[PDB]
Amino acid sequence: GAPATVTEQGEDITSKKDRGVLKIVKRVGNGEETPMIGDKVYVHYKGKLSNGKKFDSSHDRNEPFVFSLGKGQVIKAWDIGVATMKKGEIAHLLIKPEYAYGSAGSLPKIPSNATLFFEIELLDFKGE
Ligand SMILES: COc1cc2cc(c1OC)OCCOC/C=C/CCOC(=O)[C@@H]1CCCCN1C(=O)[C@H]2C1CCCCC1
Fold this sequence. Notes:
Blueprint: H1 2-9, E1 11-12, E2 21-27, E3 40-49, E4 55-57, E5 65-68, H2 76-82, E6 90-95, E7 116-126
Antiparallel strand pairs: 1-2, 2-6, 3-4, 3-5, 3-7, 6-7
Bound molecules: ligand A1IOC.
Subcellular location: Cytoplasm; Nucleus
Domain PPIase FKBP-type: 30-118
Organism: Homo sapiens (Human)
């Protein structure tokens, strides 16, 4: 499935090159700008545990998901991954626990030491 494809084929976008955040661009976006830290970012996403045992989508709530990049509003892997995306891009991310919820997890949704998968569409971003 998509998670295994990212394992095999994704780019390691971590600074440490520890394969903690792997990315495939699935649909190319437009322009040269990518979000800077502080920017207000608008996304649609679908996510799940690598193992399929829980799922989540912006669509569940009927509206884009909006966050400020780098303000600790989302997991580290999103701050790292979404900062690489262009407006209109769709990407897949596979994420090791050290860039998500770690050894503690976040019960009941996220177990300890969980690997996470997301599809993310970058709809728009704007400067603070
Ligand atoms: C650990 O708690 C949750 C995790 C996730 C979704 C949750 C959630 O309950 C608070 O509720 C849906 C509404 O929440 C909005 C974003 C939350 C920030 C925390 O989430 C994140 O930083 C990441 C990136 C942004 C989108 C949501 N995502 C999640 O980790 C998801 C999680 C994805 C894997 C499957 C289960 C849900």
